[PDB]
Structures are given as C-alpha cells and as structure tokens.
Design an enzyme around this catalytic site. Structure first.
Site, PDB file in Angstrom:
ATOM      1  N   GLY E  67      -0.249  -4.593  13.786  1.00  0.00           N
ATOM      2  CA  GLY E  67      -0.882  -4.851  15.065  1.00  0.00           C
ATOM      3  C   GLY E  67      -0.977  -3.578  15.887  1.00  0.00           C
ATOM      4  O   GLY E  67      -0.926  -2.471  15.356  1.00  0.00           O
ATOM      5  N   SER E  96       4.001  -1.473   9.655  1.00  0.00           N
ATOM      6  CA  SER E  96       4.496  -0.384  10.494  1.00  0.00           C
ATOM      7  C   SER E  96       5.242  -0.873  11.733  1.00  0.00           C
ATOM      8  O   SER E  96       6.405  -0.518  11.952  1.00  0.00           O
ATOM      9  CB  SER E  96       3.323   0.510  10.906  1.00  0.00           C
ATOM     10  OG  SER E  96       2.325  -0.240  11.578  1.00  0.00           O
ATOM     11  N   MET E  97       4.587  -1.695  12.555  1.00  0.00           N
ATOM     12  CA  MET E  97       5.251  -2.193  13.754  1.00  0.00           C
ATOM     13  C   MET E  97       6.311  -3.223  13.393  1.00  0.00           C
ATOM     14  O   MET E  97       7.371  -3.276  14.026  1.00  0.00           O
ATOM     15  CB  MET E  97       4.225  -2.792  14.716  1.00  0.00           C
ATOM     16  CG  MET E  97       3.037  -1.884  15.026  1.00  0.00           C
ATOM     17  SD  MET E  97       3.484  -0.200  15.503  1.00  0.00           S
ATOM     18  CE  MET E  97       4.643  -0.508  16.834  1.00  0.00           C
ATOM     19  N   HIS E 121       3.919   3.226   7.843  1.00  0.00           N
ATOM     20  CA  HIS E 121       2.907   4.273   7.855  1.00  0.00           C
ATOM     21  C   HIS E 121       2.862   4.859   9.259  1.00  0.00           C
ATOM     22  O   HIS E 121       3.585   4.422  10.158  1.00  0.00           O
ATOM     23  CB  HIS E 121       1.544   3.732   7.414  1.00  0.00           C
ATOM     24  CG  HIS E 121       1.039   2.599   8.251  1.00  0.00           C
ATOM     25  ND1 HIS E 121       0.510   2.780   9.510  1.00  0.00           N
ATOM     26  CD2 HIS E 121       0.977   1.268   8.005  1.00  0.00           C
ATOM     27  CE1 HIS E 121       0.146   1.611  10.006  1.00  0.00           C
ATOM     28  NE2 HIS E 121       0.419   0.677   9.112  1.00  0.00           N
ATOM     29  N   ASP E 170       0.800   5.180   3.435  1.00  0.00           N
ATOM     30  CA  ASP E 170       1.471   3.889   3.331  1.00  0.00           C
ATOM     31  C   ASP E 170       2.607   3.949   2.316  1.00  0.00           C
ATOM     32  O   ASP E 170       2.417   4.392   1.180  1.00  0.00           O
ATOM     33  CB  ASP E 170       0.467   2.807   2.933  1.00  0.00           C
ATOM     34  CG  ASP E 170      -0.688   2.695   3.910  1.00  0.00           C
ATOM     35  OD1 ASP E 170      -0.493   3.008   5.103  1.00  0.00           O
ATOM     36  OD2 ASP E 170      -1.791   2.292   3.484  1.00  0.00           O
TER      37      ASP E 170
END
Ligand SMILES: Nc1ncnc2c1ncn2[C@@H]1O[C@H](COP(=O)(O)OP(=O)(O)O)[C@@H](O)[C@H]1O
Ligand SMILES: Nc1ncnc2c1ncn2[C@@H]1O[C@H](COP(=O)(O)OP(=O)(O)O)[C@@H](O)[C@H]1O
Ligand SMILES: [Mg+2]
EC number: 3.4.21.92
Lengths: 192, 167, 341, 100, 192, 139, 55, 44
Positions: E67, E96-97, E121, E170
C-alpha cells in the site's frame, strides 16, 4: 465492516461505533480527500462538542493528501470561532490543506509524530472561458494564496515574505524540520 | 374540617348519607409531599397512619396486601374499630403503581394495576378483611370486620413524566 | 458517661486503622452528633432534630467494613450489616427489606433502647441502579424513619406479641459500596474529557492515590450519572471517601496494629519461650504478592499462615531454640528460617 | 409547585425544624452560640439548585462547611460564639471562633 | 456477509461482529491494501485498546499485498508511542509496508507461520511536472527510503548497508529465513 | 432451624455437649464441636445462614462459647468454578501465548487448596461466617 | 408432611406397621416399609426460603 | 367527577367561610364554576 465496541458502566451496556466511541472523548478523525460532504460532517462534530462542554479541549487527528481550498478554509473559521481549544495531530501525510489545518490548532497543543511527512504548496485552481472571466478568477485565487499565507505566517510566527518563497512550490518537511518553521510546538514519541 | 364535622355528625339522623372527598397530592420531587402528612399528625386528635405503595401486591402473593394499611391504623387507635373507622390515611408513592404504558394488558401487574384494582372498594367503602391479628388479640380466625365508607384516604405521588403528558 | 470527643475516637480508630485520615474525621463527628442527640431526648425547645446518614464510597479492599466494625466495637452498642445485592422488592423471591431489621433485633438481645442506638452497615449498594429502581425506592423510606412490623420471635417467645415496632429515624445507616467507574465519571466533569488518544491520561503508573483524591471531589451530580436516583442521594448528606491501600501501606498495615498478623504470631510463639522476628525485606515481598492477586488484606492471612504452617509443625519438636528470624525467601517456600538458638 | 431559591432560604430559618435551628440547638449543648449570616444562606440555595438536590441537599452542603469546625470545637474551651459567613461555604476561609 | 456471535457474560448475552469479538480480546485485523481509511481505522482501534488495559499485549495480524507508505509510518509511530507491547503476526502475504509493520512489534513477540510469505523492497513513487518539482519529489522519496531502512535495521539488527543491498530489488523470505534476517523472533507451527 | 422455630435450635447443641461434659463448664469450654450436614443448607437454606450468625459469634446454666472450635465439611457446592473466576486468567480468541484450555482440566483438588476468602463470599457466604474461620484445611 | 403441620407425620408409618405386627416390638422392627410415589417429593421450588416444602 | 367540581368550586369558600361571621345564606352561580367570579355572601 466497521467494528463495534461497548462501554461498560453502572447503567448497563451500550454498543458504540469505533469512530463514534472516540467522539465522546472529543476526538475527530480527518481521513481521505477533502470534500464538501466530509468537511461539513467534521464541522458538525466540532459544534456538537461545543454544545456538550465549551471548556474541554478538542482533538483533531489529520491524515489527508490535500483537497479543495474552500472546503478546507471552512474548518479554520470553525476552530478559531468557538471557545474550545483545538488540538491538531499530523499523522502520516499533511498537504497544503492538511498542514494549513495543522498550524491552525491551539498554541502549545500542536503535536506531530516523528515518522510523519508534511507538504505545503500554493493553492490550486483553474477556469476555462472568456478572457475577462479568467481575470476575475485569476485575481481571486491570488487573494486566496496571499490570504492563506498570512494565516500560515501568523500561526507559525515566521515572516510573510519567507513563507511565500517556501510555499511558492511544493516544500516537503519532516517532523523535526516542521518545528523550525513553527507549524508545530512539540513532537510526541513516547508516553512521558 | 369536613372530616371532623362528619365525626361530630356521625349519627347522621338526617336521611341523607354524607359522603367523603379523597385527596390526590401531586408535586415535584423533594417538594414536601411526605412532609405535610407527618406535620398534620402533630396536631390531629384522631388515629392517623402512613404507608407506601411500593410494598403492596395483589392478594395471594408473597408481598403485602392492601388490608395491612388498616392494621397500622389500629395500632394508633388502640384496636378500637369505632375510632379506626373515623381516621385519616396517607398512601405515599402512589405514582409507582401506575401501568408502565401497558394499555394492552399483556401480563398481570400485581405491583401496578393489580394494587389499584384492590383499592377501588377501600376508598369507596366495603367490609375489609383486616389481617388476623397485629395487637393484643391472640386468635387469628377472628378476621375483624371494619367498614371504610367514612375513612378518608389521601394518596400522594411524584408522577415523574406527567408534566410532558400535560403539555 | 460523657461520650468521648471526636479526637479520642480518631486517636483510637488510628490504632487499628492506618490511613484514611479524612474519612476518620467524618465518621467521628458524624456519629458523635448522631448519639449526642439520642442521649438528650428533649432540646429545651420544640425542635425535632433530624438524622444524618453516612455514605462510604471507597474502593474494594479498602476497609469500609473494618471502619464500621471497629467504630461499633470501640463503643458498646449493637451492630449489623447487610448486602443490597441480596435484597429485592416485594412479590419477588428476593429477600425482603424487613429481614434486615430482624438481624438488628437479634444482635440487640431483644431490646429496643439498645437497638435504637445501633449502627447498621449496608453494603454493595452499587449494581442495583437504573437499567433495580424498585429496590432503591423501598430503602428510601427505611433510612428516613419507618414504623416496621417485625415478628416478635427468636428470643424465646418474646412477651410482646403485637408485631413490635422499631423507630428507624435514630439508626445510623452507613450505606457503603465500591462504585466501579465513578472515578472516570468524575474525571470527565472536573478535568479533560479525553480518555482515549495521544493527549489523554492513561492510568498505568500504579497511581493508587489518584482514585482517592479523585473520589474526594465527588458531588451528588456525579452519582446521578452512575444511576443513583436523586432522592436516595439526598437522604445521605454525609459522604466519606477511602483511599486505595498502597504497597507501603500493606507492609505498614500489619506492623502498627495491636491485632497485626505479625504481632499475633509473636504472642503465641512467646508463650512457648521462642522469639519471633519479621525482617522488613520479607514484608516488602508480601506486599507485591497481595497486589498480584488483588486480594487487598484478606489474603495476607493465608500468605503468612501458609508460609509459617511448616515451621509450626517443627518448632515443638525442638529444644534450645529461643529465636526465629523470617527471611524474604521463607514466604515463597524456597527457604526455612534459621534457628540460631 | 417546585421550590425556588427564595423558598430554600425561608426553609432554613422560618420552619420550627429548620436545619439552622437544629444545628444551633446542637451547639447550645456545649455552651456556644451558632450564628448564620443571611448572605451565606443565599450561597447555599444557589449550590443546591446547581446540584439538583433540593431541600435534602441543604444538610449535605452545611455538613461539608461545618465538618472541620465540630472536629475540634468539643475539645477546646473559652469559645463563646462562632459566626459562619459566605466565604466558609465557598471554602476560601475558616469560621471565626470568638473567644470569651 | 460477516456472521454474528453471542458472548455469554454476567449481565447476560451480548451480540458482536466476528471482528468486534476479537477486538474485545485485544486483536486487530489488517486485511487488504494499506490506505489512509484503513490505517486511521486501525489507529483508532489501537488507541481504544490502550484505555481498557495499557499493560496487556495487543495482537496485530498482518495480511496485505502492500500500500501507501504514508499510512504505514502513521501506524509505526503508534506502536512506539503507546505503552503496551504490540505482537505482530504475519499470515499469508506481507509486502514492504506489511513487513515494516511486522518487525515494529515488541522485541520477542514477533511470530510467523511456516507457510507465510514476506516481501520487502524499496519505496515506490513518481511525479509528473516541471524539473524543479521532480527534483523536490526525488529528494523526498529518497529521504523516506533512508528513514525506513534505518528503522528496519534497528528492529532486524542487521547493518544499514546490508538493508540497502538486500532492498535494491524485491526480496522474498520465508519464516525460517526471517529469523536469520531478524524480521521475526520465532515461528509458530503447533500449539505448545 | 431458626431461633424462633420449633425444630432443633442452636441452644440444643449447647445442651448436647453439656451432657458429655458432665455439667462441667471447664470441659464444655474447650470441647470440639464438629458441625455436619453443612453442605445442604448452603445458600442457593437462605434463612439458615442468617440463623447461624448467632451460633458463629456464640450469642440450665448458659455456657459461653469461649473456645469450642467449629468445623465444616463439604459446605460449598461449586467452589471450584468460583475459584477459577478469581484465579484463572489469560486471553480468549488468539494465537500462541493466548490460552486455549477452556474445555480441558488439570486438577480439581489443587483449586480448593488455593481457595481465597474472596472466593468464599463470591459464592454467597457472609463476612462473619468466614470472619471467624481464620484457617482452612484442604482435603 | 413435616412434624407440627396439620398433615400426617412420618411417625404414623410405624403405627400402621404395628397393626400388622400386632403391637409386637420384635416383629415390628423386622417388617418391611414400601414407600410408593417417592418421586413426588423431589423439591422443585426455586429457592424461595419464605415458606417450607411440607411435601 | 361531580364531587371534584363542587369541592374545587367551594374549596376556597370553605377555607374562609368558617372564620367569617354574620352570614346566613350563600348563592352559587354559573360564573363561579368558571373562576371569573367569586360566590357572594348574603350577610345578616
Ligand atoms: N416546603 C418545605 N418546607 C420545609 N421543608 C421542606 C419543604 N419541602 C421539602 N422539605 C424538606 O424535604 C424533606 C422531605 O422531603 P419529601 O417530602 O420526601 O419530598 P417529596 O415529597 O418530593 O418526596 C424534609 O426533610 C424537609 O425538611
Ligand atoms: N487499613 C486497613 N487495616 C486493616 N485491614 C484492612 C484495612 N483496609 C482494608 N482492610 C481489610 O479489608 C477487609 C474488609 O474489606 P471488605 O469488607 O471486603 O470491603 P468491601 O466489602 O467494601 O469490599 C478486612 O479483612 C480488612 O483486614
Ligand atoms: Mg416525599
């Protein structure tokens, strides 16, 4: 989809909404793009708190990427007009309108978390039509830009000319950097 | 004054049969409803007793009965039916035996409508069935008979909410 | 026999109760008045002195019962208690309010003069507020004078057989209860209305004194929010709050009192010729134990007893022992107090 | 009709069983006069209406204002009279104990 | 549709939503993409739990494909701000988040399932406009990456340089690999 | 039964032990008095517990209740449940650490061994009843 | 019914037995007592405690 | 209900009539039932 909670007291059990339950504690959430419907709704929350107790502080948590200028300025007049002090909290993102509503909070009650981003820029607009009409709208938006900067400089304590250069273009600022500009008074990292 | 007159004129030689006018005290909370009753006894020369309607229930239940009211009146009247038949009563909290908007008559409100249905003849006059004994009297089957056609019955309450109904 | 001045009553109450200094003054003058009138029926005039009831709004395990019990035992008068949660209106299975008067007469030894000078102690008044209301309506009269009808029996066929009356306009009704939540209600009326958020005040610093000072600012309006009907509150003019037993208090609570648990064992062990000591470090550990289980001071009796059970089983089987010094490890069960003779 | 502020002040002085007459009779037992300033009564009435306690709240208000006074009064001597005033009810002063 | 459940208590029976029932037990669900509306909702839940019991652990189940970054930093500050420890559990997918919020939990309370997937990432973004504005936005996103990597290294324990090399593209990691990298503290296979 | 009833009274037991004591107060002063059948009258009768307050405090030649030790057997019915309502704690719906032992049992006698005075009143007992029972033996 | 009430008392059961036993204490204590309808005195009251369950 | 009307109408009258003297007759009229007027007293 929105979870519900209960507040247990001597009278009994009452089911409340997660956003409604916090409103009882004088807490307002400003989430998503700014618009007439969401802005007017927030104003209603402010007035309701004034009716219940005009002497207790109001907490405003702002998280928005910006929006309409007219809709945003409506809130500013509502916070300064009523007697209660309005606390503004910057969470995640604060654009021109979100930051304008942040520095508009009560002095000494403007907080911002360490991992937060604040952006400021001149207001946006536009108009298509005859030349004489463009001059009217072009002259009007200029007043808005200067009028808004005057409020930003007054609450921050900085100078109008300095603010104009900063807001001439998009200016990104971090939490500690925000304090230097005067947009906020303190940073909240941990309890006590 | 009228009550006292009826006592002096209790012989009622005149063919007419003088009636009685019962009072209904309505007042806000903390206004002095139960105070006026306690203040009148300080000067009265006839048996007077107080009671409460939040403890009364229909006949045949574990709660109290409406005939208990007449038992307290005898304790103050030295168990003298004649004197007890010319006394004043004050039923406090008469607003707590009011139907809770149960006009359809769903269930039996033994604490509300049920108690009201038992006093319809006590305020008017009837041969009440006094409890077996609450005095010197040793037996119980005696079931002392008393008439309540000349016994004033005051009823006071607060009627919290009636102000809205009126408006 | 001139009644003792409130100072004396306080000094005496302090001996058996450490802390709650404000409540002690309230319950000294309030009862000194409630009895100064009863011993003088007339007033050299036509005045009719009233009654002042006491409302003990304190936290759980604070000793509301202890104060009432101790106040009665210091004097020579009858004392009874009850529990609002074990009472109900008429027509229901729940115990009737008149039952409370029975216990009072039983304790009075079939006497009215004594019973008139009694101090009943209602408890658990909370939890029967609005949404019950009916139970609070009946008690509203009893506390302000009622000629009740109590069966004259239980005292071996009492000579009086006329539903012996008892005036309830001279009995000190000490109605207590632990109002769980009142602390929050008061804070929303005397300080910031923010309980949730970044600028609110979360109570996690073990500030046990906070509730005590908060309750001291209680007002009748605060009780209305709790549910309590306005009339009931009006019948209780006197109000005395109790603080929350602190960790330092716990250690202190069994040090000073003449009937302290520590001293109790010292007395019996001294009868056998052996001495008993309790190192202050041990006491500090005990305090933390009581807070871990939140059993106030009720559980202190089981803690020390359990820690000394084994010890008592071996002391009479020994000779030449003349001293014992309990250490901090004795209570947890990992050590046994050294015998130094 | 619901009681008014004026009625509350009259209730404290005119009734034979008024609180003033009750507490005053109590202070006479120890040989000391009890005076109540008329201006103070007005304060108490306003408090009661603010607390929505009615006449019953009057006793509570007075008890809080005279609690500490009676805590030391029976233990002292040479006190001929006391004069309660509006400031006592507010809690910004202590009742003066005239000696004699 | 979300089904209803009954909870038996002393006062009687109370009905709650399946999510509301777990909220009472100090459990919050983080499902779907991370946006401002969802983040503000989760923040209100976290603050609400603090009032009921500021000393009890909080459970945060994370399952998201990723997101906006602004939203994540808002939640990260909340975990560090509030006193009670927050337990983060990764179930399904974690981007990631999701990963950054997963390692922000209380040290020693970070769990992970054997078949859970964790992806990390660098931040993504962009801007279209004049070169001067692009330069400002370019430096802004660059600072975010540095600010995020510095925090990622603290919880994981790895050096700052290692985070940069591993996050250039990634990086997918399983539950056992997460422990070695330090993103988690333990793996939950079976009860007890 | 109640002190005003016709059935067995508390004074009756005082008499029972008086006979065993040979009308010697010294003997009946200390003599143990084990109270049986105390698990049926347990508050669900209700009036019996109220009629026992006198016998607990100790209210022909009257014999004072100086040191006649009182005992009880199997008094409570579901004490185990009451104990778990004050000792067993943890979490409900969740993962890992959160307790998942709501339909599993560990020990029954252990709960009674850790009984607290709070639990006693929590089941319906009265303060004085347990107020004069400063010791407890877990069977 | 319990003792004292107007109803029969359990003591009369032995009296009936004596008739069969011809008042012979020995034979009386060696008899058998069949109590029918024992399932009818299984108290169903919801702990009222005001009155007693005579049956 | 009739008793309520007569009592209310003559309530004030009965509160002051005993104190008064030199009164022989009293005549009630329709206006007294509305409250606009007061019942007159035939002194003598
Ligand atoms: N008009 C009044 N004059 C004097 N005292 C009053 C008056 N009204 C109420 N009180 C006080 O209130 C108390 C009685 O209240 P109560 O009559 O029970 O109120 P309510 O009738 O509204 O229930 C008494 O102690 C009395 O001093
Ligand atoms: N200051 C104190 N000194 C001694 N004991 C105390 C004190 N405060 C509380 N207690 C303990 O509290 C117990 C009584 O509390 P309790 O009656 O249960 O209060 P409540 O019924 O209001 O919860 C007693 O066993 C007593 O030992
Ligand atoms: Mg009244």
């Amino acid at each position: 989809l929105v979870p519900m909670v209960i507040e247990q007291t001597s009278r009994g059990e009452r089911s409340f909404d997660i956003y409604s339950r916090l409103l009882k504690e004088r807490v307002i959430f400003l989430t998503g793009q700014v618009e007439d419907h969401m802005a007017n709704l927030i104003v209603a929350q402010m007035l309701f708190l004034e009716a219940e107790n005009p002497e207790k502080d109001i907490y405003l948590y702002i998280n928005s990427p910006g929006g309409v200028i007219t809709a945003g300025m409506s809130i500013y007049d509502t916070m300064q007009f009523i007697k209660p002090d309005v606390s503004t909290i910057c969470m995640g993102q604060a654009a021109s309108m979100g930051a304008f509503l942040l520095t508009a909070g009560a002095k000494g009650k403007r907080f911002c978390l360490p991992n937060s981003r604040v952006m400021i820029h001149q207001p946006l607009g536009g108009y298509q039509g005859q030349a004489t009409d463009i001059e009217i709208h072009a002259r009007e938006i200029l007043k808005v830009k200067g009028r808004m900067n005057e409020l930003m400089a007054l609450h921050t304590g900085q100078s109008l000319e300095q603010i104009e250069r900063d807001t001439e273009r998009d200016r990104f600022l971090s939490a500690p950097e925000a304090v230097e500009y005067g947009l906020v008074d303190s940073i909240l990292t941990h309890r006590n | 004054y009228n009550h006292y007159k009826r006592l002096r004129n209790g012989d009622t030689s005149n063919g007419v049969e003088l009636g009685k006018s019962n009072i209904l005290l309505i007042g806000p909370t903390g206004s002095g409803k139960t105070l006026l009753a306690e203040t009148l006894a300080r000067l009265l020369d006839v048996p007077f007793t107080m009671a409460d309607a939040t403890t009364l229930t229909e006949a045949g239940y574990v709660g109290e009965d409406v005939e208990n009211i007449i038992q307290k009146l005898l304790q103050k009247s030295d168990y003298d039916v004649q004197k007890a038949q010319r006394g004043i009563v004050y039923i406090d909290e008469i607003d707590k035996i009011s139907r809770k908007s149960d006009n359809p008559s769903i269930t039996r409100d033994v604490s509300g409508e049920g108690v009201q249905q038992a006093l319809l003849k006590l305020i008017e006059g009837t041969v009440a069935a006094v409890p077996p004994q609450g005095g010197r009297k040793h037996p119980q089957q005696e079931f002392l008979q008393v008439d309540t056609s000349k016994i004033l019955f005051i009823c006071g309450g607060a009627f919290a909410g009636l102000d809205k109904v009126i408006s | 026999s001139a009644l003792p001045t409130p100072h004396e009553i306080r000094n005496h109450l302090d001996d058996y109760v450490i802390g709650q200094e404000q409540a002690k003054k309230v319950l000294a003058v309030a009862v000194y008045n409630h009895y100064k009138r009863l011993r003088n029926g007339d007033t050299s005039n036509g005045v009719e002195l009233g009654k002042s009831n006491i409302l003990l709004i304190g936290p759980t395990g604070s000793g509301k019962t202890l104060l009432a019990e101790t106040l009665a035992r210091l004097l020579d008068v009858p004392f009874t208690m009850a529990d609002a949660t074990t009472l109900t209106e008429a027509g229901y299975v729940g115990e009737d309010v008149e039952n409370i008067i029975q216990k009072l007469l039983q304790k009075s030894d079939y006497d009215v003069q004594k019973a008139q000078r009694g101090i009943v102690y209602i408890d658990e008044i909370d939890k029967i507020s609005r949404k019950g209301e009916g139970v609070q309506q009946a008690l509203l009269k009893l506390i302000e004078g009622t000629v009740a009808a109590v069966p004259p029996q239980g005292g071996r066929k009492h000579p009086q057989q006329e539903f012996l009356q008892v005036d309830t306009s001279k009995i000190l009704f000490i109605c207590g209860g632990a109002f769980a939540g009142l602390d929050k209600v008061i804070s929303h009326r005397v300080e910031t209305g923010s309980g949730i958020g970044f600028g609110a005040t979360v109570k996690a610093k073990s500030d046990k004194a906070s509730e005590g000072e908060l309750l001291a600012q209680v007002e009748p309006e605060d009780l209305i929010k709790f549910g309590l009907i306005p009339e009931f509150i009006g019948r209780l003019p006197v109000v005395a709050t109790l603080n929350e037993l602190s960790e330092e208090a716990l250690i202190q609570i069994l040090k000073e009192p003449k009937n302290a648990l520590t001293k109790q064992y010292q007395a019996l062990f001294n009868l056998e010729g052996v001495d008993l000591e309790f190192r202050d470090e041990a006491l500090d550990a005990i305090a933390k134990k009581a807070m871990a289980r939140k059993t106030g001071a009720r559980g202190l009796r089981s803690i020390v007893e359990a820690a000394l059970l084994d010890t008592m089983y071996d002391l009479p089987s020994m000779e030449d022992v003349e001293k014992v010094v309990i250490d901090e490890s004795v209570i947890d069960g990992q050590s046994e107090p050294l015998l130094i003779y | 009709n619901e009681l008014s502020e004026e009625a509350l002040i009259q209730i404290l002085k005119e009734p034979k069983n008024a609180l003033t007459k009750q507490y005053q009779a109590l202070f006479n037992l120890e040989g000391v006069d009890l005076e109540f300033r008329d201006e103070a009564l007005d304060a108490i009435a306003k408090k009661a209406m603010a607390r929505k306690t009615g006449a019953r709240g009057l006793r509570s208000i007075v008890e809080a204002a005279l609690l500490d006074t009676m805590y030391d009064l029976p233990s002292m001597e040479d006190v001929e009279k006391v004069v309660i005033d509006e400031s006592v009810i507010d809690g910004q002063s202590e009742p003066l104990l005239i000696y004699g």
